[PDB]
Design an enzyme around this catalytic site. Structure first.
Site, PDB file in Angstrom:
ATOM      1  N   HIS A 280       0.834  -1.232   0.000  1.00 46.00           N
ATOM      2  CA  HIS A 280       0.000   0.000   0.000  1.00 46.00           C
ATOM      3  C   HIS A 280       0.864   1.277   0.000  1.00 46.00           C
ATOM      4  CE1 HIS A 280       0.263   1.025   4.324  1.00 46.00           C
ATOM      5  NE2 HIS A 280      -0.149  -0.215   4.647  1.00 46.00           N
TER       6      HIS A 280
ATOM      7  N   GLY B 109       2.836   5.932  10.558  1.00 48.47           N
ATOM      8  CA  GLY B 109       4.239   5.735  10.167  1.00 48.47           C
ATOM      9  C   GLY B 109       4.763   4.369  10.561  1.00 48.47           C
TER      10      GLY B 109
ATOM     11  N   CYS C 254       3.611   1.367   9.769  1.00 44.24           N
ATOM     12  CA  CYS C 254       3.472   0.295   8.747  1.00 44.24           C
ATOM     13  C   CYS C 254       4.847  -0.192   8.288  1.00 44.24           C
ATOM     14  CB  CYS C 254       2.676   0.764   7.547  1.00 44.24           C
ATOM     15  SG  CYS C 254       0.983   1.168   8.043  1.00 44.24           S
TER      16      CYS C 254
END
Ligand SMILES: CCOc1cccc(C(=N)N)c1
Ligand SMILES: [Cl-]
Ligand SMILES: [Cl-]
Ligand code: NA
EC number: 3.4.19.12
Lengths: 300, 305
Positions: free
Chosen positions: A41, A143, A145
């Protein structure tokens, strides 16, 4: 003695954490040999969030649209492919800090350490379990991820989780390092919600065994139970069913403490009925379900 | 969101841990620059530990009596001195993995990460508070002695704790890295007990702020209070006195939530008096006191090292 939520030493994972940028999106990547792994993503813009066509968005990218940074060093991307929900950026340098590692997909009830990272810099380490509903109760801000979950039994780092998203109840969803989601979740911002969660019965029993090893006997009783009668009671408290596999896995703790697995089940049934009456077990006033039989033996 | 007991990343400290053996005793050492730090009681036999004369036992020893292993590498010990309850073993080689570091002595109520080690090998990391009674509630087995406690501020590791012993109740006692004990303890096999402990008030309030930030809000109420009124309830429930310094340190959290400290103290006043009325706060049935205001701000704002 003592009994704590203990994480693995995080250093072998620290030396693999990098920052990945694509467009205006920055998150964490995992740098092993000549590959950086991150959530796919990262290539989504603001309209791509509902129904991203990942094959379509990725074919439009060149190696130079990905900015990968290992502390101050820019790493040069020389290839990119997708495996399920994970993006694999090939880089021109193998990570000299790469440890012995493997990728393993875990089952609900399993525990691991999370190295929470922001901008490729590690923030903290903590212990989690894969909940029966395939979520984890993490501590994750924007942040985070690309942060990973790992075990380190015997010098080899077993990667089992990469962080993708926060669900509306404040719990977390992610993939194995082959990019397959835990549970029915997808990397789209379509409405999704976790199933009703349950207590990991086998882990609660292991922790009661821990408590006995550490000298606390107050919650034992002179009763026993059949496995079937135990499950009929426990499920009325939203406890997971205890299988014969679970009973087998506790055999060693049974043997060390001299308390038969189904005698410990009788103790658990009573604790669910009575609560703790102001007492605590191993510093907790609730029944703890995020220690496995294996964690109990490792720490005791 | 979410809220977890979170250690500092331990990599900078893993690179410093070694194995120290003196006769039959193996335990852990901390290798910084060209010195290895470990508990002085490594030099003691079982007999010695009842009433040791460390002055005397130490002069009798020599460099060759100490075996220092950095993994599968022998370090050459070329000097040995004692500072309070800590042994300093000078070695021929500077640790090439020495991080930027200070030795710091922490205050009761302050938290730190423990890297639990066996045979010089890092085994696990967990967060502890220095209890008001100067013990920590650790998880330590035979061979954990010399394990260290630390904080990280940017790139600088502040070492604050070295593990020495377990007390009869299952709690743990140790020294700063200059060998001064935390609490009224001595490094001999004798009769020692932890004093009656108290609850760290400012840390409970910090945790209630973490709960609100995560949308646990039930315990809030319309009321407020004062230090004196609150403090008189605290003393009754074996809670540390709350000071003006504590109120100022929670200031950021009071701001970010719109619950002023004595507003929140009024919430906590009520929880001690009435219990939790069968609820939980951040998945605990207890009032948790091992998170500092800094811990809550750092965790709920993503601070990185
Ligand atoms: C058909 C299954 O019959 C047995 C016999 C013996 C052991 C077990 C067991 N997994 N504890 C199962
Ligand atoms: Cl598993
Ligand atoms: Cl002496
Ligand atoms: Na209030």
């Amino acid at each position: 003695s003592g009994f704590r939520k203990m994480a693995f030493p995080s250093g072998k994972v620290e030396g693999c954490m990098v920052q990945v940028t694509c467009g205006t999106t920055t998150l964490n990547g995992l740098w092993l040999d000549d590959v950086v792994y991150c959530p796919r993503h990262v290539i989504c813009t603001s309209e791509d969030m509902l129904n991203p066509n990942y094959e379509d968005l990725l074919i439009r990218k060149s190696n130079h649209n990905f900015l990968v940074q290992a502390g101050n060093v820019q790493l040069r991307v020389i290839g990119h492919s997708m495996q399920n929900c994970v993006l694999k950026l090939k880089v021109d340098t193998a990570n000299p800090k790469t440890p012995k590692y493997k990728f393993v997909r875990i089952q609900p009830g399993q525990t691991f350490s999370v190295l929470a990272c922001y901008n490729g810099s590690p923030s903290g380490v903590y212990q989690c379990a894969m909940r029966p509903n395939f979520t984890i109760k993490g501590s994750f801000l924007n942040g985070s991820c690309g942060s990973v979950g790992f075990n380190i039994d015997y010098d080899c780092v077993s990667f089992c989780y990469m962080h993708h998203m926060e669900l509306p109840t404040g719990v977390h969803a992610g993939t194995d390092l082959e990019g397959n989601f835990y549970g029915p979740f997808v990397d789209r911002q379509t409405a999704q919600a976790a199933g009703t969660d349950t207590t990991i019965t086998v882990n609660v029993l292991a922790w009661l065994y821990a408590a006995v090893i550490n000298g606390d006997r107050w919650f034992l009783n002179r009763f026993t139970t059949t496995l079937n009668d135990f499950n009929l009671v426990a499920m009325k408290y939203n406890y997971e069913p205890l299988t014969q596999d679970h009973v087998d896995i506790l055999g060693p703790l049974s043997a060390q403490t001299g308390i038969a697995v189904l005698d410990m089940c009788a103790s658990l049934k009573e604790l669910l009925q009575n609560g703790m009456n102001g007492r605590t077990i191993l510093g907790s006033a609730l029944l703890e379900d995020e220690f496995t039989p294996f964690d109990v033996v490792r720490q005791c």
